[PDB]
């Protein structure tokens, strides 16, 4: 199609050829090629490549994620590249560690350690991302301190009257959830332990009060204290839940998905192109954070639906004008935060459920 | 449906009887709730981003949480499917409303380091009614221990005065701060069987003296307890709050003047479509001052069953601010005012303060 | 007659008193500085500059434009007795704003020193004495008596071991203007305590007539030096119109013997006798240069001097070129034409005479 | 014959030694460097940079500023011994300045440690070492001597503990451009004090001949990290332009096997022979691409390996389109190209090379 | 004589102030813009605020300059008009002042240099001040700042006599002949006030000066010396050479007339058919005013140093003119000035009595 780098047909290739397409090629050259402003130039904390980006501070422990799980299956499709995707690994956790990326914690008023008692949107991502190089590299580097966030995880899910933890105090979220039960997955598959135990639990309560079974959609927000549910749901939460879930309980993602489609996704220029409502009750595509689209090409990807991911992408990649200047790649007009982090996982992404089975080296 | 409007009059009034809130308020609840980190009820914790954007002047955040929490009130008594998320919208504003940022105003310009332990009687007037009202939508004794601290203090404070009341910045005494620490021991009583109200009968006979003037059925702007003095200009803003906040307390008393403040100020135009309020005497302009006589009187108007006034004020304020609804949440691209977004909200649902210390407990 | 893009009459200035109540423009200028919470100038007795940060205010000069509003606001006292009350708040304000750091902390960044009255710096705390004073005969009040007796105390001490008449501002400069001020506020507290402070007055009139004025041109230099004795060599007409004001007060004779002089030395009338304008110095054609306030002090001094046609022409010079307007009962200036503007014109307009401040007769019950 | 907008010919500076005497343009450099109180870069010792905020040089690269402004200073001592006291004196001024924080501190802010010598942060440690030794050839004077021998130490001590073949820059980064500058300083004390550091050389040539080059195509790849044992799979041409530069100072040999394979691999000649450009990597047309620094590196390799025509294509390429200027007998450019201009352009037109530098006779 | 297009007053007048005993109308002017005005003017108070510099956009390292410059001017007001005397002196006492506040010499400390201005080295501030001191009490005959001037004094006399060179550094091992002149100018004011003979050093300067830092051919000083290498910075510069010249005629004054002929011919160029002059700043180009831009408005003080009515007023032609003079409630403005301290060299130069008779002012 126009304005496309290169075919759907040869994106979903890319496990089989044993190699990347040309243009995922030069996105890993945006993110390690120029001395000091690449993103992965060196494990310091120092994020001039955010700034540049215009990444608000909030945010930029969402993009050191998101590069991280495009990373673990760039080292499955190419072992020659697995060195590489390990020693990117390895200065993502090290800049996840910088107060610059936490910090909001404090100066919100919430505490002066991350890692202690709630703050699941941060260390839920810390977790399953320190697992994740220990399955790419075979390193031991960071295993104390995997052990001891995993243990913390594992404590604070037993002692809860509600299955999971919070994010800020009394602030519920399924997403964030969501990594922290596969990160205690990828420590049971490294370590020959039960943590993943608590799943079952978990996914029996998101399916009480905290999804609309008929629309297959989560709803945005619960509150424990109150125990109030906010009464929008979202396309954006549910895309990133059903994508991780499947990793965990294929059966319960493959039952939402078609539903979830129904519920969200608009069709059009005959059939050549999609885009994503966020909530019901409106027209109008990618509102609220402006990530619908995006993550549910991500999905897309996790459920081997190659008509939607092609949909979506010609929906989201043209009017963004990529363009390869010395074989690295860069979008001149990004459609909303965390894009070249997205359509990199996207276009790369080889199923939690491959990552978890990560043949060592 | 006049031009450039979300919804009736008619509608607007019939909430609370449907028992559900108009599409176009469920559409505020979402700008107040829905995207992450920059939503106003987003956490408990101290970030204004919301304020920010808005470019919300700090001496005003505290009046901007106050208007949200007495909306919030009502919507919780429309719809009780909605009370827990109105209990937990309130939670987060008790929450915001003790940060430095919000009365750091007080230690800056060098009145104390404590906002509540003596005077400013505008910021912990808010306060003390939004821990009660708090506690009569969920039943939570989160705040209780403040709340009783707080209201002992302005009992003590009220009882030590030789005038009915309490100072906001010292030597300043203004009747809406006044009005607002009054309720708020109204509420008190309702929770807990006490007798604190008591002191609002010596208020009322007090602000009828001097501080009124009752041919035009306006407060003046303020009084100085050391000189004696009384501003000697009449503020529509100042009498629209107050009288809207009385009605709960001693309806007839607003009954009694609300007659001769629409005389005083209200201007109809536009072959009686809608209306505009002037903020003081001796002008034909509107909305001087702090520009928000307009704005209060659609508040007040609601208190008082007032349809065809709201309507003809609603017709003025909202469409020049051009209202949208976009992903099924509101914004206006040229809100008129200062607290446009709050008091707007809190005039479409309000039920009345009556209604509020009546409100049936949740178990 | 109303002259083009004026509110009041000069017969209706000057009528105030009489008719026992200020014009509905004077009024609208009391709205500007009470109405709005928060931004005008006498919202409370709080360390707030609001009002002076929206006008552009340099911090040099905030001690001025307190002091103006204060000396205005006295007469107000004395016009209206509905509005003394009102005028006595306002004063309690103005003393309250007058002591924060914001104000005098000048003095300290300057480096001559951590306390501001202490010792020198007669412009600041002249203004601050006479203010102490004039809040005391509007209200009645001793709130600020002990704060008033202990800076008299400093200025008569001071005063006492100077070999030269007066007190210096910043260390080395003598000013006569500053002087004026600190020697009145002398007179003031004479008046509420029926003291004799103002003895000093004699020494101080006989000083200030040896090198510090041309009496030929009946204007005062611009400043004089103690350590080397030195007087800089130019005349000043915003220092000459503000010192004979303020004495006419304490000795009328002194300021009737060269008003005159002044007015030959100085004021231009201009477009057939309807305007004026004044020259800052000597040796030039130009109008208002220097600090830019020679023709607002000369019309303080016409008001004080009961010299209505001086006052007429030279309100048509400053008022129409600043677009006035009245909005919900307050008044503004589009383009005020000089620092301090809608203080000394709201001044000049209500003055009532130095000696009848002095003479203000006691408040009601 | 002049090509359009250039200062002076090729022959003119490739003649400079022999002549005794630098060009004209030279001269005016240098005015640039020395003339204006307060705001020239050799202005004094103090630790201010105002020369480098007026230019907008970014702090990370003023350490590279001043390491090619003095390796460019040393052949000017070659060149014209009636300037070589001049030289002394801004080496000196070099030296002083590299040692600011400012201009290193970059390495605690970064989270890596409070002192910039102790381990790795070998890209800053290289070039002060080989500077400490360049001022003390030109000038006989040691001053800095208690200083360059700690250092030397320092980085003999660290080789020597390391299984790969030289030291990291930040932790778990390894450059072949940052180990060839301290290894060529490694030489320069050798040939100053009669030790023998130098004979950790060998293993360093074999060691990045392994996995670090493509032999075909004579060029380095970009970066090694020795936890993973990844290589960087892109081919950077500044990187090897730089390499070759100062390996040939070493072992001639080698840079002489791959020199004509760089040229195949990244060297585009246009404009009917008069001009070239280089490229930054493989599978690309575009020229100067990443830090922009290809051609100008390509330039300074030119010089070292005596390859006048070359030289005089990139720099019909690089010069005349900044737009030069001479006022009052100063040199200034209206439109420089990349960063390190004015820098780089300096140091290519008076390179002596590297062996000369190290061969450098006696002050008299 | 004719009055030249815009031009305030006649070469013949500024010559004639002493003789008339009054100054021009536009120097009155110029002492006006100094005094007059409240809190901006820069002699308003002896307090530590710099708000006239400020509005005037003057960089930090000039504001000692600048002050410096006004006080050499205010001297020979004093001479010029006894009426005026004692308004000299305030402005004197308040430049003193001014000069030791931290705004004007804390780039010493910032720089790296040190915490204190005066102990060692730094010639540059505390020359200037040394001189001040001194003027200061020529003018008025007050003692207040006679400790202050006895230390300093003897500190410049102990660092001449411990130095192996003669004279004193500025920043370390940066040696500059301008700033020397002013110190040894500064002995020869204090020998003159208390009967010593400090001034027994000039001889040694001069002989040291004359050696390798003169071209005795062309009659101009080279740029700087920096004692650590010996190194003599190439360059001749005119702004140096016309400023020690003047300094120097005060203290020897066959020295300065030895070389002022050869001094005009090497830099000063005559065009618009003599009506006109402006000074190159260095050898080797056609360019005026180059490096600090100040070498036309030293050379203005030179000729009337040096009795030269002709150059003087082909230099005024040159530098006045263009920066459009404006005279607005009796007080002197320039609207667009030509380059750093400005108002400044041109009030000295319009007054200037000559450096021989400031030493010799008769008392108050």
Known sequence: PPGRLAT??????????????PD??????????????????????????WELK??????????????????????????????????????????????????????????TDPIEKENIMYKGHLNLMYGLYQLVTGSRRYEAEHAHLTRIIH???????????????DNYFVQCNSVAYLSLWVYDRL?????????????????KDLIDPERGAFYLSYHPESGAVKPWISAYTTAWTLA???????????????????????????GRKARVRETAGTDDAD??????????????????????????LNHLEPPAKPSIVSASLRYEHPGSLLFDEL???AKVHAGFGALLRMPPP
């Open 8 to 21: 759907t047909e040869d994106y979903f290739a890319q496990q089989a050829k044993q190699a990347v397409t």
């Open 24 to 49: 995922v090629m030069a996105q890993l050259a945006y993110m390690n090629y120029i001395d000091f402003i690449s993103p992965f130039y060196s494990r310091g904390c120092s994020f001039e490549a």
């Open 54 to 111: 215009h990444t608000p501070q909030r945010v930029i422990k969402y993009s050191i994620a998101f590069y991280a799980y495009g990373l673990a299956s760039v080292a499955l499709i190419d072992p020659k590249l697995r060195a590489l995707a390990g020693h990117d690994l390895d200065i993502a956790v090290s800049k996840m560690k910088c107060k610059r990326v936490w910090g909001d914690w404090e100066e919100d008023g919430f505490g």
């Open 155 to 169: 404590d604070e899910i037993a002692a809860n009257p509600f299955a999971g933890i919070v994010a800020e105090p």
């Open 191 to 207: 370590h020959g332990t039960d943590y993943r135990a608590a799943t079952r639990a978990w996914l029996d309560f998101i399916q």
């Open 244 to 270: 991780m879930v499947h990793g965990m309980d294929p059966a319960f993602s493959e039952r939402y998905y078609p539903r979830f489609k129904q519920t969200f996704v608009e069709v059009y220029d005959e």
């Open 287 to 312: 509102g609220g954070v402006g990530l619908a689209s995006a993550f549910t090409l991500l999905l897309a990807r996790e459920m081997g639906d190659q008509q939607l991911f092609d949909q979506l």
């Open 343 to 345: 359509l990199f996982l």
